[PDB]
Assembly symmetry: C5
Homo-oligomer: 205 residues x 5
């Protein structure tokens, strides 16, 4: 307890909070999606509701420490309010994202941060053809709302969405789910991760 | 990092926040709408739901700096809570506006601020005739709720609503969408009031 | 900007906030309703939903200033959190009121305050007969939740509800709409403004 | 204004807030319900929605003053955040209580506090038989969530729910409505107020 | 009153708040569920709604005191905001949990804390077969979202969910309800959950 309180005091009370990236000090944020359930489909509004968690990883020099100066603490947990977090936004949401997990992040001695918010998201998707073998494909882009590619670069470690927590008795079967980095233009480049999900009705009973 | 922290400290910790415009120091706010989806229509209540983002631009002397004194930083991002933002309100909404984007703004060295809130809005609209070739026209005015034309002037850079992010598989097809400044008066008052009239003509998507 | 920051600093940072009226220093609050839409009717629950704004006016000595000492500023806008506001409540609501406008008020050099919250309100109303020529009448009382008539007096400037922003393609046509002060008893007297609205389905 | 600001300063800024009752300094909290409407019934989930206000009364030495030292002020209004309030909870709610009134209380010179929150409550109730002459009976217990009978003694002044603000054109007619203290044992006593409401669908002719 | 104000001042104003457990100072949190109602079932979305309260118990050295130094006060009540609370999360919820009780905890002189939040939870559950004698079984795991088994250990005092406040006129009858500690791994570090398993049917 004593060493951790010291470590947190040294990192957070002394310095101001990290103000975010700039053109000369850009930040790479790595995203991975863990899809849990397609909960609902609305064919009259073309809205589909997903439950997932979203692993976010980035690294800052100002959060580094030597474990030896702090009782060999290699990492700790702290409220996401205590640190800067990236402003990752679904571009085609139709309702505010509903938060399903505590807003708490893991900080490691090398300055790495891991934050895994669980979310329910309504987004624009035409479900026509969902009761077929071919199913239906829908997509939603995740991006920083305010930072260009020169400030925040997004990437994934893998192109495959993790389906290992996908609810086995969901009304919808996942045929494929990918997560792919894209470069958009508008004067200046912006980056997104395109979440593409192909699915169909699983018929039961 | 070091230079940006200094710049933010110099602008925000020293001064109080901008208290808003007055009759002798008015503010011009420029609006542009980027329509993403007509999500639903309710013909039993005459409510229609829009998803859009709304680019807002204004300029303040107290947010100016010289890039040379701060490592050639020309702009930065910061929480909208750190600065004054205009109170732009839909005049004929039927539900509170739902916020769909982070409350973060871009501040430029000349004192310009750009803030682009994404929103879902329910507003008053009779959709009768939406299932026809002519479609239906609906309108909603955006205005400062509390400031007259002598304190906040609203304008647009273009009369055409940007449809470039409009959802291609929406249930509703956009036939036209305009955004037009209007000057209103009222018989007793000694002041004009300004709005931006968003006018959208649309129909159910055909086969 | 500089003068306004000074004025706000002088009024708000120096003094504590106005603590509200007392028996020896009562406050008159003037109310006026501007009805925009009857949005829906629920005949299975006897709830009706109204969209309106509500102009509220009162006056306090502690908010006065001389324009000459502050660059001829005659009035300003500020967050409703920065000042005392009256706690005007619908007596027969069935859901929390939904706020449709920024919580910002206008303060004038004489100490006058004007606050105009736009609201969506669900309230108790039997709509039976709404599909007829005579239509249906419903009423809702607005009152301070906590202050008696000896602390807050409510009144209206006019008996007639302003219908000038009423939505022309509403499903419901307004036949009449009045706003009238009432005195209630239970020992101490309490004041309300009774909003009475007669309406029908548009023909 | 000047005297009231002084009085509030003397009561709130000097002392810490009242930390709540203990076994050696118990508090009596009196409840009364004022039922306004049974708004809806859901026979597929056995949930019923009530609108009411709930008058809460208690008394604290630390909120006493002499009116003569403060311009003959006998009472004032203040935000419920400025004072301790009891944690009275419906035991069988199915949704968070929806607040319909400002969170403001009335404090009197003798240290009495009156707080009257208006609420919409969804609670567990089987409405089967509501469309009959006998109607249906449903009940919900109100209790302090954390305090025993040795810390908060909870009571009513009357066993009859006040129906004087009940909406005359409600879909549901109130046949009876009571509010009755129940004192339980298990060594320490635990208290609730049982709100029991018998009602039926309003009859045109029957 | 005077002694309690002193005690709270000494515990909360002097020290910083407990920062949470670490690998070298782990915390055991004991959970018990008190099921009140299965309120609804949605067979078109496979969501089921439960109302329950959840007794949570843990112990911290920094919240200890000697009753003799504080007028023989053995325990007190305080806002949950005044102390650290564990971030116990339903792993398969579909909506934010709705809070049905005041956020207030009981702290005892030995440093024990008891916190009993009442909740309405929507979670993933296929109700197909609920209208039968056998009924249907559904499960939801409760876990710390952020702490491994080396920081937070979860357990139960009993394997049986308390049904003593279960609503007698619910649309759904409880056939069985268990609460069981589980140890999970992934392809390195172990994480702990309490599996709430409920078998139920439509009331006949
Ligand atoms: C708010 O309104 C006030 C009147 O409506 C303005 O007051 C005026 O300010 C002027 C500028 O300082 C004064 O001018 C001066 O006049 C006197 C003789 O009256 C001369 O001796 C001075 O030389 C002359 N100024 C100069 C620079 O030579 C006016 O006298 C004065 N009028 C009044 C009080 O009635 C305020 O300036 C105005 N505030 C603003 C615009 O911020
Ligand atoms: C479309 N988005 C992702 C959000 C809204 C928006 C609205 C805009 C804009 C860019 C953007 C972008 C996004 O937001 C930015 O502020 C931004 C964006 C992308 C790339 C950028 C940006 O600033 C410099 O380079 O330029 C003028 O109006
Ligand atoms: C609807 N708004 C934008 C706000 C509230 C309001 C309240 C009113 C009114 C018009 C308005 C308008 C608008 O906003 C004003 O603040 C305002 C408005 C119009 C005309 C005015 C105003 O103040 C003095 O004369 O007429 C009488 O009471
Ligand atoms: C009905 N209202 C408006 C709200 C709730 C309420 C509940 C009550 C009561 C008065 C009131 C009034 C209103 O609220 C007050 O607190 C109050 C009210 C009116 C007059 C008063 C009051 O306190 C002293 O004099 O007396 C007993 O139970
Ligand atoms: C339902 N209430 C009133 C509140 C919460 C609660 C939570 C519980 C419990 C009983 C209760 C009761 C009430 O609150 C208590 O703390 C309590 C209660 C009743 C009986 C008790 C208690 O502690 C020892 O014996 O048993 C296990 O977890
Ligand atoms: C699935 N959860 C509950 C949340 C997200 C997550 C994301 C992960 C992970 C584990 C977890 C777990 C849980 O959250 C943690 O932070 C965590 C978790 C389990 C085990 C752990 C953990 O940190 C060290 O050992 O390992 C790599 O990326
Ligand atoms: C921390 O690591 C060192 C290096 O091996 C180890 O010997 C020591 O036991 C650890 N810390 C403390 C406080 O003993
Ligand atoms: C506290 O405990 C002691 C030990 O029995 C007792 O004799 C004493 O009277 C108590 N004092 C107070 C202030 O409660
Ligand atoms: Cl940081
Ligand atoms: Cl500003
Ligand atoms: Cl004030
Ligand atoms: Cl108190
Ligand atoms: Cl703690």
């Amino acid at each position: 307890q004593a060493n951790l309180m010291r470590l947190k005091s040294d990192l957070f009370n002394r310095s101001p909070m990290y103000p975010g990236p700039t053109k000369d000090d850009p930040l790479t944020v790595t995203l991975g999606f863990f899809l849990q359930d397609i909960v609902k489909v609305d064919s009259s509004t073309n809205e589909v509701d997903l439950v997932y968690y979203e692993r976010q990883r980035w690294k800052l020099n100002s959060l580094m420490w030597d474990p030896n100066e702090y009782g060999n603490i290699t990492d700790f947990r702290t409220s996401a309010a205590d640190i800067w977090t990236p402003d990752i936004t679904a571009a085609s949401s139709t309702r505010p994202v509903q938060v399903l997990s505590p807003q708490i992040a893991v900080v490691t001695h090398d300055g790495s941060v891991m934050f895994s918010p669980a979310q329910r998201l309504s987004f624009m998707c035409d479900p026509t053809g969902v009761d077929s073998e071919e199913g239906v494909t829908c997509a939603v882009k995740f991006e920083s709302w305010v930072y260009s590619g020169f400030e925040i670069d997004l990437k994934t470690d893998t192109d495959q969405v993790d389906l290992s927590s996908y609810y086995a008795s969901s009304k919808y079967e996942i045929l494929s789910a990918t997560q792919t980095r894209q470069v958009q233009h508008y004067g200046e480049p912006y980056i997104d991760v395109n979440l593409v999900v192909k699915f169909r009705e699983r018929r039961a009973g």
